[PDB]
Design a protein around this ligand. Structure first.
Ligand SMILES: [Mg+2]
Length: 415
């Protein structure tokens, strides 16, 4: 059966080197799955990691979340069937007791949520992406690679994340190759120039501004042998609630900023702009929607905080046209898939994302295909807690045989 027998937890370290929560579920059929949770630390609206505090691991201890698993979650889940993800995830949700998943920790609750679905697919003999996404799920996603980290990670280049997106590629296999080829070209470009140590997501680091970034990457694309736009597009997370009394800096206002964007949108082949105009600045979103609505994809990172209540409002109130999907924000798979399915009933595009503190876990690879997002943001072809998702996506495409199809240009309609 898909009947949960054991649920044990471990304290392990993420890509930053900071404790997180590893959950090991045993199904009665014999299945034993691993799953790891990534902090990547924010907001009140996001779920609340149960961290230790104290001087152990600089307050970043996860012992309580672990003990929380073995003491309470484990016995609460043990004996149920993994194959009722909605029922397990609700059961986990209640047992906690709060809005913020504060009491049992969202790090511990997702960890249980995910180690279930892993076992619930190795039960059924379904690769994770098939099982969770059924069998029509065959869309290998455009890799949105964050080659250059920026302001908020020097606030000199105010943009946070500068992304290569190989929409032109005939396959995911090729799309991976381009990205790596071009990341390695930009290594070359910046090596020759004074500008090459790595950032938290494998992204490279002073800089003149937004234009310098673009100017740099355009050249890297050309240097790699690819044409910008047709082969490799470009995209960014501004994280504009880092620029911010009225707080735009890049000095600009929301409507004034929409023009800054409009400028970039004309010359540089932008496929998607992430978290422009703050998180709570609803007015800015409607103006940005009005201004660049159908020339660029506009995606909500911190605005929507992967929470359906806020995205509903944004969709109803017409903020953005696509959502960034962070599983650890929301805390459960079922709640996460609801996020996807709400947005897909509504028709916002999906972009499954990582966090800055990642693990060797590659579930986001499978998850992204299963939801057929057509887009995955999982970092530069560099740190292996980035690359392992990419390799995983190799294998899935391998697995899919002729069934596979690479989102590519139909990932982003506007170009
Ligand atoms: Mg961001």
């Amino acid at each position: 059966m898909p009947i949960i027998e054991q649920v044990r937890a471990r304290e392990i370290l993420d890509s930053r080197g900071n404790p997180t929560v590893e959950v090991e579920v045993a199904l009665i059929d014999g299945t034993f799955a691993r799953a790891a949770v990534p902090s990547g630390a924010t907001g009140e609206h996001e779920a609340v990691e149960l961290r230790d505090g104290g001087d152990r691991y600089g307050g970043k201890g996860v012992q309580k979340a672990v003990q929380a698993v073995l003491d309470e979650i484990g016995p609460a889940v043990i004996g149920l069937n993994a194959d009722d993800q909605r029922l397990v995830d609700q059961a986990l949700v209640d047992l906690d007791g709060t809005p913020d998943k504060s009491r049992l920790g969202g790090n511990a609750i997702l960890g249980v949520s995910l180690a279930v679905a892993k076992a619930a697919a190795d039960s059924a003999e379904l690769p994770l992406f098939r099982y969770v996404g059924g069998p029509n799920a065959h869309i290998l996603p455009v890799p949105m690679m964050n080659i250059l980290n920026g302001g908020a990670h020097d606030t000199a280049v105010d943009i946070q994340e500068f992304m290569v997106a190989p929409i032109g590629a005939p396959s995911f296999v090729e799309a991976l190759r381009w990205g790596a080829e071009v990341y390695h070209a930009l290594k070359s470009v910046l090596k020759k120039e004074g500008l090459t140590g790595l950032g938290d997501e494998g992204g490279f680091a002073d800089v003149a501004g937004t234009t310098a970034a673009l100017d740099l990457i355009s050249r890297a694309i050309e240097s790699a042998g690819l044409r910008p736009g047709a082969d490799v597009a470009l995209a960014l997370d501004a994280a504009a609630t880092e620029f911010f009394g009225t707080g735009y800096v890049f000095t600009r206002t929301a409507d004034q900023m929409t023009e800054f964007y409009a400028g970039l949108l004309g010359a540089y082949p932008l496929v998607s702009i992430e978290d422009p105009l703050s998180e709570d600045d609803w007015d800015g979103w409607a103006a940005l929607t009005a201004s660049i609505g159908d020339r660029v994809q506009i995606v909500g990172d911190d605005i929507f905080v992967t929470n359906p209540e806020r995205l509903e409002e944004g969709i109803e109130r017409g903020v953005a046209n696509a959502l960034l999907v962070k599983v650890n924000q929301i805390g459960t798979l079922t709640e996460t898939l609801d996020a996807v399915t709400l947005a897909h009933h509504g028709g916002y595009r999906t972009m499954i994302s990582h966090r800055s503190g990642e693990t060797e876990d590659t579930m986001i690879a499978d998850l992204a295909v299963a939801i057929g997002s057509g887009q995955i943001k999982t970092g530069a072809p560099a740190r292996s807690e980035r690359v392992a998702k990419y390799n995983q996506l190799l294998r899935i495409e391998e697995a899919l045989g002729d069934a596979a199809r690479y989102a590519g240009d139909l990932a982003f309609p506007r170009f």
